[PDB]
Nucleic acid binder design. Structure first.
Length: 580
DNA sequence: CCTGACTCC
DNA sequence: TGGGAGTCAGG
């Protein structure tokens, strides 16, 4: 705990070396248009702290930040990059991101500050951010000498930890996953977040006004049916109405009381008509609270854009997540909610939304990894995979598959990927459990390679302690040999599912990198707006639709080569709603 | 604050 | 007794 550093008043030349650890500190969790509170640089020549007002107005330092040949090691470079974009400054030459390095080494550690990464290599000459800034209403930037030391210690940590982290990644055969996939993707996500998505607020506000009316009507219908007013949004009060007043059967309990889950309420419809009304109300209520009000609260009013933050270092499987607002859970399944998408529009006149989605990428990945002959052959023929499973399960010709049979078979196909049990499948489909069990037993008899994969992958997890994806992402599963059935079983389902979900994540991430390259190469104005796990959303001048119709699916389908084809569907239109 | 509701993949 | 997420109101 004896670290010399220079608290500089102006920028000097020795601060602009062609390799440095750089800290551009943004303390607000949402870094969009957020203040930069301080800057640290550590390099061959020493350690430096700079005041943003100085350094970000210094044409020399700004030149250095944007010089691609001046290499920077950072932690969470996307945060710095975006915060600098809001200040009108370009950051290039980031060659190492410790956040992403830590994430690839072990997603379970939940590393979100430099101290937590440093802990992976027993480096303790740096403090947690929460310790320096405090939490909640106590959160605050400390006095300059304290801030400065903290920023410098974070930079010094990055400086000393780069080699050890790269050394383990390389030993794990994950170094390319970092340098050629995650770090390039970070820059692309930075572009997407900063560009944002334009919102039709007049349309959203009108929809909210009508929703309020409808909510009120449904609400009063519910009180009439219930014979009493209560808070419908309180599972506790609801549970009293349903299971005590109306004496409906109790199908499930949770740790706190009667369950009122959608699954449960659906099964109560043969008993009382009120449950259907209540489901409708809770649906409409979430629309109003989250997709009207919540969304309007985060729109930047002068530009009418919303700027999500894609968390790249959070999920245990390699997926992104999306926050403040979450733009990866915009309604689509019910027409009532789907119309929310009418409010998501192009950012320029005479532009259109272009949405491209992988068809059944998880099942194609399963087919590939399990190398199951019958499943691979179906995909090579582009036979409807749900129709095919229905034929095997029910043992019928293709022309005998009722839409109900296909409905059930779809539930089987997707459920196998999550390790569904017969209980779960019976409840999902609301069918006989004896029958549900027979569906699963017949599925594995028809796709024996999948059965072998599920057995082999759990054996692998037990022997190695972790499972891996196509592009060498890992997930450690230290509970896989627990003597406790629930704990062990959950870990076995993670072993089964993670190579599937995680490889699908790998593939779309690489597609984004390849797509951006192709877009720039061809000087197209089109650009990415969102990723939604197995979907990519873009906007572009209307003139460019013809090109994207060929280019986007092609790049997505060719991202990796599997033993089965990848297939991508696509649509475009005047709003996200219309891109279907 | 957690829990259980809704939303998405 | 179904894998991975985030936000919301109620309590």
């Amino acid at each position: 705990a004896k670290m010399a550093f220079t608290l500089a008043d102006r920028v000097t030349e020795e601060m602009l070396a062609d390799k440095a650890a750089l800290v551009v500190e943004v303390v607000e969790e949402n870094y969009h248009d957020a203040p930069i509170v301080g800057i640290a640089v550590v390099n061959e020549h020493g350690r430096f702290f700079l005041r943003p007002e100085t350094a970000l107005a210094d044409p020399q330092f700004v030149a250095w930040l944007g010089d691609e040949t001046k290499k920077k090691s950072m932690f969470d470079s996307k945060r710095a990059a975006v915060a600098l974009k809001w200040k009108g400054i370009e950051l290039c030459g980031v060659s190492f991101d410790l956040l992403l390095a830590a994430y690839l080494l072990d997603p379970a550690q939940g590393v979100d500050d430099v101290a937590a990464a440093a802990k992976m290599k027993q480096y303790e000459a740096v403090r947690p951010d929460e310790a320096v800034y405090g939490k909640g209403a106590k959160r605050a930037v400390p006095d300059e000498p304290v801030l400065a030391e903290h920023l410098v210690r974070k930079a010094a940590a990055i400086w000393e930890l780069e080699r050890p982290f790269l050394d383990e990644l390389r030993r794990n055969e994950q170094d390319r996953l970092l340098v050629e996939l995650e770090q390039p993707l970070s820059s692309i996500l930075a572009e997407m977040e900063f560009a944002g998505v334009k919102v039709d607020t007049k349309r959203l506000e009108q929809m909210g006004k009508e929703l309020a009316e409808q909510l009120g009507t449904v609400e009063q219908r519910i009180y009439e049916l219930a014979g009493q007013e209560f808070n419908i949004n309180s599972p506790k009060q609801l549970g009293v109405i349903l299971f005590e007043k109306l004496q409906l059967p109790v199908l499930k309990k949770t740790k706190t009381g009667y369950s009122t889950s959608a699954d449960v309420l659906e099964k109560l419809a043969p008993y009382h008509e009120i449950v259907e009304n209540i489901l409708h109300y809770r649906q409409l209520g979430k629309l109003q609270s989250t997709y009207i009000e919540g969304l309007l609260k985060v729109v930047r009013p002068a530009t009418k854009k919303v700027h999500t933050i894609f968390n790249q270092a959070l999920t245990q499987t390699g997926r992104l997540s999306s926050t403040e607002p979450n733009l990866q859970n915009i309604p689509i399944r019910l027409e009532e909610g789907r119309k929310i998408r009418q409010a998501f529009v192009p950012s320029e006149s005479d532009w259109l939304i272009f949405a491209a989605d992988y068809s059944q990428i998880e099942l194609r990945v399963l087919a590939h990894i399990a190398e199951d002959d019958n499943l691979m052959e179906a995909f090579r023929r582009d036979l409807d995979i749900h129709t095919k499973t229905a034929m095997d399960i029910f043992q019928v010709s293709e022309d005998e598959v009722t839409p109900n049979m296909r409905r059930q078979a779809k539930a089987v196909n997707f459920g196998i990927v999550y390790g569904i049990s017969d209980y779960g499948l019976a409840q999902n489909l609301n069918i006989s459990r004896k029958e549900a069990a027979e569906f699963i037993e017949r599925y594995f008899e028809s796709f024996p390679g999948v059965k072998r994969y599920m057995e082999n992958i759990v054996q692998e997890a037990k022997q190695k302690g972790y499972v891996t994806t196509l592009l060498h992402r890992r997930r450690y599963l230290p509970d896989i040999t627990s003597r406790n059935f629930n704990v062990r079983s959950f870990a076995e389902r993670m072993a089964m599912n993670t190579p599937i979900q995680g490889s699908a994540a790998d593939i779309i991430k690489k597609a984004m990198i390849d797509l951006n390259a192709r877009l720039k190469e061809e000087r197209l104005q089109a650009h990415l707006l969102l990723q939604v796990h197995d979907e990519l959303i873009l906007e572009a001048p209307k003139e460019e639709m013809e090109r994207l119709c060929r280019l986007v699916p092609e790049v997505m389908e060719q991202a990796v080569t599997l033993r089965v084809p990848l297939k991508v569907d696509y649509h475009y239109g005047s709003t996200w709603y219309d891109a279907k």
